[PDB]
Enzyme design. Structure first.
Site, PDB file in Angstrom:
ATOM      1  N   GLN A 185       0.813  -1.210   0.000  1.00 12.41           N
ATOM      2  CA  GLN A 185       0.000   0.000   0.000  1.00 12.41           C
ATOM      3  C   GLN A 185       0.854   1.271   0.000  1.00 12.41           C
ATOM      4  O   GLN A 185       0.346   2.369  -0.214  1.00 12.41           O
ATOM      5  CB  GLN A 185      -0.927   0.004   1.220  1.00 12.41           C
ATOM      6  CG  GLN A 185      -0.195   0.135   2.555  1.00 12.41           C
ATOM      7  CD  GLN A 185      -1.097  -0.054   3.766  1.00 12.41           C
ATOM      8  OE1 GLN A 185      -1.556  -1.159   4.050  1.00 12.41           O
ATOM      9  NE2 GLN A 185      -1.356   1.035   4.487  1.00 12.41           N
TER      10      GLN A 185
ATOM     11  N   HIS B 166      -5.618  -0.897  11.498  1.00  7.10           N
ATOM     12  CA  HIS B 166      -5.105  -1.487  10.275  1.00  7.10           C
ATOM     13  C   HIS B 166      -5.968  -2.649   9.773  1.00  7.10           C
ATOM     14  O   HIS B 166      -6.265  -3.585  10.517  1.00  7.10           O
ATOM     15  CB  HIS B 166      -3.667  -1.955  10.522  1.00  7.10           C
ATOM     16  CG  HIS B 166      -2.972  -2.477   9.301  1.00  7.10           C
ATOM     17  ND1 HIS B 166      -2.778  -1.706   8.174  1.00  7.10           N
ATOM     18  CD2 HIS B 166      -2.419  -3.681   9.043  1.00  7.10           C
ATOM     19  CE1 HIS B 166      -2.131  -2.421   7.273  1.00  7.10           C
ATOM     20  NE2 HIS B 166      -1.899  -3.620   7.769  1.00  7.10           N
TER      21      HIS B 166
ATOM     22  N   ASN C  96      -1.127  -9.365   4.697  1.00  5.94           N
ATOM     23  CA  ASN C  96      -0.947  -7.937   4.921  1.00  5.94           C
ATOM     24  C   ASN C  96      -0.623  -7.254   3.591  1.00  5.94           C
ATOM     25  O   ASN C  96      -0.361  -7.923   2.592  1.00  5.94           O
ATOM     26  CB  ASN C  96       0.200  -7.713   5.918  1.00  5.94           C
ATOM     27  CG  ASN C  96       0.211  -6.313   6.518  1.00  5.94           C
ATOM     28  OD1 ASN C  96      -0.701  -5.514   6.302  1.00  5.94           O
ATOM     29  ND2 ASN C  96       1.250  -6.017   7.296  1.00  5.94           N
TER      30      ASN C  96
ATOM     31  N   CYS D  77      -4.988   0.560   3.583  1.00 13.46           N
ATOM     32  CA  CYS D  77      -5.086  -0.861   3.910  1.00 13.46           C
ATOM     33  C   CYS D  77      -6.525  -1.372   3.764  1.00 13.46           C
ATOM     34  O   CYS D  77      -6.746  -2.509   3.337  1.00 13.46           O
ATOM     35  CB  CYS D  77      -4.601  -1.101   5.337  1.00 13.46           C
ATOM     36  SG  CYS D  77      -5.615  -0.261   6.557  1.00 13.46           S
TER      37      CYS D  77
END
Length: 215
Positions: free
Chosen positions: A19, A162, A182, A25
């Site tokens: 990102q 997040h 992630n 995110c």
């Protein structure tokens, strides 16, 4: 639900993305859940456009943060989301340039998992596929994670900051975990992934803001 599920083994997950510096995110988490449903429904696995979400979901704040639910509703009301190739990620908010000819997936809305219910999240992951979730990833331990089932006694369940993607769950040497994808690149964690403690009092608020798109 089975004791272990990993959607990467079933071809529901695209490669790990980055990102950048943008707080997008939520956009990568949303796109991840949609790509999973797209593969499951059409058998095609392709990169969807997080930039499309960052620029056009006015219900969210672009690089300033946002919610996955708003992203799913946008896709549904917009009648589609573009592929990454039709709407490249630039890591900065720009005017909305959605192009329907580049449409790669659709959304019939979304469903939320009961807050704090890890058993409900496990059921959802097993029955639906990758699920979008938010966690407290502000700790030093999270940034420098490399292996094992992540657990930090200082994780704040009420401090979700997040969004990530739960692509499965399992157990390692008796330690139950969630398999989390992630969006900080492949150098972070274990090739971009992290195993997070499961059934450990909703560690890091993993089950506090979980949702998936209906397709």
């Amino acid at each position: 639900a089975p004791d272990s599920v990993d959607y990467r083994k079933k071809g529901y997950v695209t490669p790990v993305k980055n990102q950048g510096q943008c707080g997008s995110c939520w956009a990568f988490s949303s796109v991840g859940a949609l790509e999973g449903q797209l593969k499951k429904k059409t058998g095609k696995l392709l990169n969807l456009s997080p930039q499309n979400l960052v620029d056009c979901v006015s219900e969210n704040d672009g690089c300033g943060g946002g919610y996955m639910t708003n992203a799913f509703q946008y896709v549904q009301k917009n009648r589609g989301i573009d592929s990454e190739d039709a709407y490249p990620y630039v890591g900065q908010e720009e005017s909305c340039m959605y192009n329907p000819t580049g449409k790669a997936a659709k959304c019939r809305g979304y469903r939320e998992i009961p807050e704090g219910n890890e058993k409900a999240l496990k059921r959802a992951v097993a029955r639906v596929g990758p699920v979008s979730v938010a966690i407290d990833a502000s700790l030093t331990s999270f940034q420098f994670y490399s292996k094992g089932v992540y657990y930090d006694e200082s994780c704040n369940s009420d401090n979700l900051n997040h969004a990530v993607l739960a692509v499965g769950y399992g157990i390692q040497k008796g330690n139950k975990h969630w398999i989390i994808k992630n969006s900080w690149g492949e150098n972070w964690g274990n090739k971009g992934y992290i195993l997070m403690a499961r059934n450990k009092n909703n560690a890091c608020g993993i089950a506090n803001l979980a949702s998936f798109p209906k397709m």
